[PDB]
Amino acid sequence: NVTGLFKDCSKVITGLHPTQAPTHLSVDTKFKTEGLCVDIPGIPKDMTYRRLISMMGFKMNYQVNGYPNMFITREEAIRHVRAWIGFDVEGCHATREAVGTNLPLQLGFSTGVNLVAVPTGYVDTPNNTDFSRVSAKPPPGDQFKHLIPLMYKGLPWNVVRIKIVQMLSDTLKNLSDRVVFVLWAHGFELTSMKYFVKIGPERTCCLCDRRATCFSTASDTYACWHHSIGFDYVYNPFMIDVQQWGFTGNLQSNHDLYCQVHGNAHVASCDAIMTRCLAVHECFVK
């Protein structure tokens, strides 16, 4: 059994030298012998590679004392309805040097905001992982036409995550002590969260008694929604996948059973808006 998490997206499928491969699976076949690997003097290390590593496939089912879990029950979500923010991401596709993973392109929220990121991925090198721009294309097909202009209008991730934190802080400061991202088919939204979410034990704000909702890599400090100006990471968010509540069929068909005023505009924020709308109708009607 293998997973897609951390799949090596290099166009040409090959493994690495045993000293460089992150895992047994990823070692070059030349070095493998029944479950083990051999060193072969004469077949040297690769000192120039750049291998795109897929962030698709995270599973947040950890159980670690003192670390709150990101994904919450329906009952806990309902207590925290004032914190609900619908969230959806449209991606672009890795291309040229790499194929097989998707990069966040348009990030949409139930506030109506869409943020556009330059295509950026995690690239292994002989010395580290390089968070860097990667070649990408919009999804092929006419239903994806609106994504073509976005491909050259993105912002760098350091700007995007600051804008996310600022949007969430402005929206939530007078609503809740947390955020609950309301998702539908959460896989790629969770992938996208890798770009702007950090987790750990509960902390307090560096300026007041409220729980920390944000983190600053520059200063290694924490803050609540009221005091997060300039902060770059969302810290300990919560989240729920509405699709997991037993629906059959797509988001729009289920949304439309209860609501007639959200026409599908085929954009990330629209999915985010319909997802929060459906969640409200399902949890609070009947």
Catalytic residues: 88, 90, 189, 266, 271
How many Cα atoms are found within 13 Å in the side-chain-facing hemisphere of 90?
25
Residue 40's binding partner out of Zn ion, another protein, Na ion, none, with CB under 5 to 8 Å set by partner kind: none
| Secondary structure letter of residue 38 according to DSSP | -
Q: Does 274 bind Na ion (CB under 5 A)?
A: no
Interacting positions 74-133 with Na ion (CB under 5 A): 119
266 labelled ligand-binding: yes
Residue 136's binding partner out of another protein, Na ion, Zn ion, none, with CB under 5 to 8 Å set by partner kind: Na ion
The whole-angstrom separation of Cα 8 and Cα 23 is 11
| Secondary structure letter of residue 261 according to DSSP | S
Interacting positions 83-112 with another protein (CB under 8 A): 99-101
Interacting positions 109-148 with Zn ion (CB under 5 A): none
The whole-angstrom separation of Cα 127 and Cα 74 is 43
Angstrom CA distances, 28 to 8, 36, 37, 158, stand at 13, 12, 9, 35
Choice from 36, 207, 208, 265 touching another protein (CB under 8 A): 36
| Secondary structure letter of residue 82 according to DSSP | G
Q: Quick one: 101 or 228, whose CB is closer to Na ion?
A: 101
Do residues 28 and 15 touch, judged by C-beta distance below 8 A?
Answer: yes
Q: Does 58 bind another protein (CB under 8 A)?
A: yes
By CB under 8 A, how many residues form the interface with another protein? 61
259 labelled ligand-binding: yes
Residue 124 bridge partners (DSSP):
51, 129
Choice from 208, 229, 257, 265 touching Zn ion (CB under 5 A): 208
Phi-psi region of 23 (alpha: psi -120 to 50; beta: other; left: phi over 0): beta
Do residues 129 and 105 touch, judged by C-beta distance below 8 A?
Answer: no
Choice from 29, 42, 48, 61 touching another protein (CB under 8 A): 61
Choice from 112, 149, 156, 200 touching another protein (CB under 8 A): 200
Q: Does 30 bind another protein (CB under 8 A)?
A: no
List CB contacts of 126: < 8 A, sequence separation 6 or more: 20, 45, 46, 47, 48, 49
Residue 277's binding partner out of another protein, Na ion, Zn ion, none, with CB under 5 to 8 Å set by partner kind: Zn ion
Choice from 136, 223, 239, 277 touching Na ion (CB under 5 A): 136
Q: Quick one: 56 or 205, whose CB is closer to Zn ion?
A: 205
Beta strands in 139-178 (DSSP E): none
- Tokens coding 278: 């459906």
The whole-angstrom separation of Cα 229 and Cα 132 is 25
Residue 92 bridge partners (DSSP):
103
Annotated binding site: 88, 90, 189, 205, 208, 224, 227, 255, 259, 262, 266, 271, 277
Chain residues in the site for another protein (CB under 8 A): 1-10, 13-15, 18-27, 33, 35-39, 41, 45, 53-54, 57-67, 99-101, 122, 124, 126-129, 193-194, 197-200, 215, 235
